[PDB]
DNA sequence: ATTTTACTAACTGATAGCGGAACTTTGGGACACCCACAGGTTACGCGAAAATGGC
């Protein structure tokens, strides 16, 4: 299975029209909630709980 | 004279009905005081079409 942590991934450029590859942190714990931070193609960060 | 058969009456079993008591079944009640819930979740992805938002 997926490690327990924080993960820092990207979407690679294949989402928006241009390439604008967008960033993001995973933190996944053994129990709980999920938490999101995550790049939109206008340089803003945004998060998501669950 | 004897043997086979048709007729009849009695026995017996099935069955519908009833009695009645036990058994299952339904509805009501309980007066210290108690006063807003979960409840797991998700690492999908893609294309369309439908609903929102921007000025």
Redesign the pocket.
């Known amino acids: ?2 490690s327990p942590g924080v993960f820092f991934d990207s979407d690679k450029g ?2 928006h029209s241009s390439g604008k590859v967008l960033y993001n942190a ?1 933190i ?1 714990p053994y129990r ?3 938490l999101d931070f995550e790049f939109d193609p206008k340089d803003n960060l945004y998060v998501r709980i ?1």
């Open positions: 299975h997926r294949k989402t995973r996944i709980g909630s999920w669950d």
